[PDB]
Structures are given as structure tokens and as C-alpha cells.
Amino acid sequence: XXXXXXXXXXXSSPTIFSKEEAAKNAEEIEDAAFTIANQHXXXXXXXXXXXXXXXX
């Protein structure tokens, strides 16, 4: 459920790449994953939490 998404997110880079709740959630975990990768499993499950928190 949220665990699955946590595992997909769990899966340094300059070459990387009801409805409103889902969209917003996705947007947030996106932006976070992107800041972390932009620093170029750490803070992966950490990212889903705030994202889940922000959209609910």
C-alpha cells in the first residue's frame, strides 16, 4: 500500500530521469526525492511519511 510506494522510492545523480490526496502525495514525494538526488534507502521511507502527512 504505502509500503509498496516506499519500496519503489527506495529503488547521487545528475542524470536521474480522494484524487487530490493522491496527486498531492505524489508531487511531494517527487520533490523530496529530487532534492536528495540533487545533493549531487537513505531518507526514502522518511520521504513517504511527510508526503503522507502533507496530503491527508
Partner: protein, 107 residues
């Protein structure tokens, strides 16, 4: 700029097809894309935009197919989420590349 224009146009069209099929609210992505394309109207950057856009197209097509095949609420939501996430990632990349494109367009 022609390759990028064509690719972004195709992505816009793909997003609308996904909207028609899934009912998802993807119009903000569409508008942001249209606006960025408007800005475009360096070859390395164009390669970046083209491949990113086409890849995103493939993913949106695939996940929309997953929405069509959805047998339940979980499968449906996971697929929608996947569409949203890929479109935001793609838009971040294209926005970044287009801004760099502008910087290069100056000097």
C-alpha cells in the same frame, strides 16, 4: 528547438489521452508543458528534452493502461500515483533544461 517542440507537443497529447482514459487531473501538467514549450519557440539540451519527454510518454501510456486494467481500488490508485509522480519528475527535468536553455541563449 524543433525536436524539443515536437516531443513536448507529443507529451501534451499523451497527457490528454491519459486524462480522457483515466479521468485524472493532469491539466496543470499540460499547462506547464505548453507554457515551457512556448518559451522554447544547446543541441545537447534538446537531446535531453527529447529523450526525457518520449520516455515519460511511454510511462504515462503504460500506467494509463494499468488504470484501464485496474481490478480494484489499490491497483487503480497505485497506477494514478505512478502517472502523477512521473509527470512531476519529467516536468522538473524539462523546466530545469529549459531554464538552462535560456541561460545558454543569452551566453
Amino acid at each position: 528547438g524543433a525536436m524539443a517542440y515536437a516531443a513536448v507537443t507529443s507529451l501534451m497529447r499523451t497527457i490528454h489521452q491519459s486524462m480522457e482514459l483515466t479521468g485524472c487531473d493532469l491539466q496543470p501538467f499540460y499547462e506547464k508543458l505548453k507554457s515551457l514549450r512556448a518559451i522554447l519557440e544547446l543541441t545537447i539540451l534538446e537531446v535531453e528534452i527529447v529523450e526525457v519527454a518520449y520516455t515519460t510518454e511511454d510511462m504515462v501510456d503504460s500506467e494509463s493502461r494499468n488504470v484501464f486494467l485496474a481490478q480494484n481500488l489499490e491497483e487503480r490508485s497505485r497506477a494514478m500515483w505512478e502517472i502523477f509522480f512521473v509527470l512531476e519528475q519529467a516536468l522538473e527535468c524539462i523546466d530545469s533544461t529549459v531554464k538552462q536553455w535560456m541561460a545558454t541563449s543569452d551566453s
